[PDB]
Amino acid sequence: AEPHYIDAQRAIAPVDAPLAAPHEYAAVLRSDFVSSYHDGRDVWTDEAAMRPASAILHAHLGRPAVVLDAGAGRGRDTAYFLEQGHRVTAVDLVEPPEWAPLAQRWGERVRFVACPVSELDGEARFDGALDNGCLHHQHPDAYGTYLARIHALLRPDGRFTISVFESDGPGRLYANHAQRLYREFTEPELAELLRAAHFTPVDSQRVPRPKAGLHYLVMTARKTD
């Protein structure tokens, strides 16, 4: 494992020290994201390779439905889902200004919550859920609880689409300069993670990131019976 650029601006380096505890890490996570959005360093928002994941989830729903956007950022995917007729709940640690014009355009069809995914209450509220680059930044000890919340929030026939950084070789854990964690996955590794979280993968796509010279891995799953 060697340091490498993960996006236009950020080089990430393999973690070699003991990780910050999950409680401390939550603050590191919020701090980096709020600074990045404030500064306009959210280079993911306008990356063209980020657009296929939402269309993939819609294809697996096939109808207007109720969709959770977990880690929704500025709302690009939320707008995409609303344009298909979905009702959407968008959740993020950081509330950006762009949620207001979206609320104006879509009214009661969109709901926004500026909270961690883990704070979402309820069960069986959504037909679909999209994680477009959120899970792969969580503390590894929090993957299970994060995915279990998604799993519980989905209805029995729910679909979950997740996009992560694709690894070249066995996936490793890295950190950016602000100490945000980045996990890259192989397809077997991501499938194994989902199966352990009681999801059964039904599709997976390697989405090129041409300007970054990398790929996203976009996997869709149902609940395991």
Ligand SMILES: Nc1ncnc2c1ncn2[C@@H]1O[C@H](CSCC[C@H](N)C(=O)O)[C@@H](O)[C@H]1O
């Ligand atoms: N535990 C958590 N709960 C809610 N949002 C989180 C989170 N951890 C990270 N995030 C948010 O996850 C997003 C990852 S960046 C991707 C943003 C958006 N999905 C897009 O497609 O552009 C950031 O907006 C970050 O603030």
